[PDB]
Amino acid sequence: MKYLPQQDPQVFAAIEQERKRQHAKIELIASENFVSRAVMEAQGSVLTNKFAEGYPGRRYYGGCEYVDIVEELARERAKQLFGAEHANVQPHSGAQANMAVYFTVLEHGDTVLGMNLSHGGHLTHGSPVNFSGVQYNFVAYGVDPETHVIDYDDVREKARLHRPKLIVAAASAYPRIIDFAKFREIADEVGAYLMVDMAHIAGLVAAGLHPNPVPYAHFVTTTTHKTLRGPRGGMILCQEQFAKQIDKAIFPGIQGGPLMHVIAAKAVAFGEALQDDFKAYAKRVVDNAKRLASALQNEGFTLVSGGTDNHLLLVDLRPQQLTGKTAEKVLDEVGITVNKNTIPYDPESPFVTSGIRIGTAAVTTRGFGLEEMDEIAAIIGLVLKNVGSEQALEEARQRVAALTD
Amino acid sequence: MKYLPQQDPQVFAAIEQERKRQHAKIELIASENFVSRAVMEAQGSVLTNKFAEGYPGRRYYGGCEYVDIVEELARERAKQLFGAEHANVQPHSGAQANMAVYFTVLEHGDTVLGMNLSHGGHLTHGSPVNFSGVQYNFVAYGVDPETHVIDYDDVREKARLHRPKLIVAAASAYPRIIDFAKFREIADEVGAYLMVDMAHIAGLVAAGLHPNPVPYAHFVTTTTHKTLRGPRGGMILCQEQFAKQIDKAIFPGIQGGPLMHVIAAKAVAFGEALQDDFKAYAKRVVDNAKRLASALQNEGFTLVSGGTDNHLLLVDLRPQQLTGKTAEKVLDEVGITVNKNTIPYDPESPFVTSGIRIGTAAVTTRGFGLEEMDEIAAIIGLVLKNVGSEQALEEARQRVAALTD
Ligand SMILES: Cc1ncc(COP(=O)(O)O)c(CN[C@H](C(=O)O)[C@H](C)O)c1O
Numbered sequence A, B: 001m002k003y004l005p006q007q008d009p010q011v012f013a014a015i016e017q018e019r020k021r022q023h024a025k026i027e028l029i030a031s032e033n034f035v036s037r038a039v040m041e042a043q044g045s046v047l048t049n050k051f052a053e054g055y056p057g058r059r060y061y062g063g064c065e066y067v068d069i070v071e072e073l074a075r076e077r078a079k080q081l082f083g084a085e086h087a088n089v090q091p092h093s094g095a096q097a098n099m100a101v102y103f104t105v106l107e108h109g110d111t112v113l114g115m116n117l118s119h120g121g122h123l124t125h126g127s128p129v130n131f132s133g134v135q136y137n138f139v140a141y142g143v144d145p146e147t148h149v150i151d152y153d154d155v156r157e158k159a160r161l162h163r164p165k166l167i168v169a170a171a172s173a174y175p176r177i178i179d180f181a182k183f184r185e186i187a188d189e190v191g192a193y194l195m196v197d198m199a200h201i202a203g204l205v206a207a208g209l210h211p212n213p214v215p216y217a218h219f220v221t222t223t224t225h226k227t228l229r230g231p232r233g234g235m236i237l238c239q240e241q242f243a244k245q246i247d248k249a250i251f252p253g254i255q256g257g258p259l260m261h262v263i264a265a266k267a268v269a270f271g272e273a274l275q276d277d278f279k280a281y282a283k284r285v286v287d288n289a290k291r292l293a294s295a296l297q298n299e300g301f302t303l304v305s306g307g308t309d310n311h312l313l314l315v316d317l318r319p320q321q322l323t324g325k326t327a328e329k330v331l332d333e334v335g336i337t338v339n340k341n342t343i344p345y346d347p348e349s350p351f352v353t354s355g356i357r358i359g360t361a362a363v364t365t366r367g368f369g370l371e372e373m374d375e376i377a378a379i380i381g382l383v384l385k386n387v388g389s390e391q392a393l394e395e396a397r398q399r400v401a402a403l404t405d
């Protein structure tokens, strides 16, 4: 940076702290990642100066010849990445991507079926304090109490009982592969649209390591950050038959001007994901996740569903008589970043929880491998099995320091 | 840029075109501006890597110590700038800022009173193809057919007749000062909340050149770009009594994770606006607007309302027997960027229009002054009075080139 340090010392100082923190900590929040310098440069571009309401070649303001090229590069790359017939790369966020799909196919008060929020469903999949739960009538399907795998017969019974206009699949904390084929079969049975929110798994989808929802879902939403390793923002994929309606839902329906500099950064991230080394990266993410799961089981930890098929894992801390909140706090003390997370049929509130959620996408990006996975697991065991030992915590601190260099 | 040119030649080429276009054209779209290099650097920062759901010191994810400082700097600077009791700097856009206020005080189907969309009201103030018009029952107040000034007796009659739960004031194409005191008096008469969308005039408010809605409105929304000359995004100001409810409306109500890098850029822009030279800049914006209005009247053009009190002006092209669409197109041919804009009681559709909207915020930022205003007006007259003369258009082209260097 050149101009920010001179113009705004206060803001620069805090940014510089944050940069150093990102290097110093072991980042295990499942939704987090580190973007390339190219992605950041696109975001820090003069494209923030362009007002571009409308769509490429169909703008409502002149001067958009070049931002049109940028947006089309994003849409075409997204379509190549996911094999979708149409992309909308303007959603400001995953929340707004979801909002737009809901706005497209639902009237106020329509019934929607989504994954139980305490079994892995997202805020925007029907929380009663989110627009989704307030605007529409959400009902929920559950995972099996033993396997912690989605109970497809419960999905089907809930659909047949409640007759939703829309079924939503995908999750913020589900460590197994989702069966989109079964979701579409149920959707077809009850005459419901199927929406897949693939935010967490989108990078893995792109790399052929998770089944692609696109051929099964009427609408696929996602964030561009997370496993896809792009800028913070949303995206909607769909077949050509819904393209016009989805585009009108984004604008003029729920947004105004798009963030053209963020869309440039989306195009950049999509370009990166189309490359072979992103495929290699993504396999290391899943490989690392499986290795981490195994090493945690080796320390004596119980994992929700017994392990992982993706980038993320959930530790059920009940056997250690710990809440997720306690574990989160103590891990924070040693420089490991997790979040407390409800587990299926959690006896604790969402603010306390009986689990922690852990993902490998961030640590994999910085070059951590299987040996680092073993060591992370060993540090977690050291800390959680000795929460009252300041000496154990100091040793943990020093081992975390050795990992991040 | 260093990494983007190497990693993504296609995206870099289009960005580079856009950069050169920004320098080459005369940008007169009223909502546009050019941000500082410090603002862009903040946007291109590693803060895009941080997930920060919740609010400063009340986050739902760890590691937010430093992004908390950044957000607080934005909120405190905003509060100092506008004298507001509470700021929310997380809205992704002006659309989302508006959506959140509506979400806070309205139920589905509530009556809202806003400015007639073809008299200067915004899309999000009740368009029937926008969430606002679909979710709530919007009724409209008008400007006087002669003066083109808001008819405060019509505001009052519409409020008393329709009994709105919320009155909205502010505009995308109103060239006179808005009387917030009268809006609040009417609101108080009918027991309605008052919301002011100050997006266009926020920089002028900050500089003491437009009356401040904050002491009169329950809720003030705005964009951070436009006259405020910051990054693209939204903001809500309000008194402390509504702080908690506004914050919950943004999250968990209508968004998820905030754009911390954009919030850093907001803090930067707010820091700039607190400085004396931003005050001097803003006066030049209004000074230039008045001078431009006068010089256009000198060319024989009719202006909506007879001139301007702010950064923007509307030309009523009916006397020249031109539509706004025709004028927009021909000005585009010579390198002047305007938009077609409906005028009050426009006989044409919103897609054709009888006017063009012109603002000076962008040209003022690049250092244009009164003499440049006279020349811009002279070029506009040359072009619009000779739409069929390729020689007039070439001369216009060369004079535009002389202005932008
Ligand atoms: C499945 C899923 N979809 C959307 C989003 C949020 O998108 P945005 O933040 O851009 O509005 C999420 C967010 N998930 C968070 C995370 O996993 O850490 C958290 C649970 O909100 C999501 O999971």
Ligand SMILES: Cc1ncc(COP(=O)(O)O)c(CN[C@H](C(=O)O)[C@H](C)O)c1O
Pocket: A051, A053, A255, A256, A257, B030, B031, B092, B093, B094, B095, B096, B122, B123, B124, B170, B171, B172, B197, B198, B199, B200, B223, B232, B233, B234
């Ligand atoms: C008064 C007013 N409020 C909000 C916005 C849009 O905010 P965002 O684009 O970040 O969602 C606008 C936009 N106005 C545009 C412009 O003036 O050029 C256009 C009329 O939509 C606004 O005017």
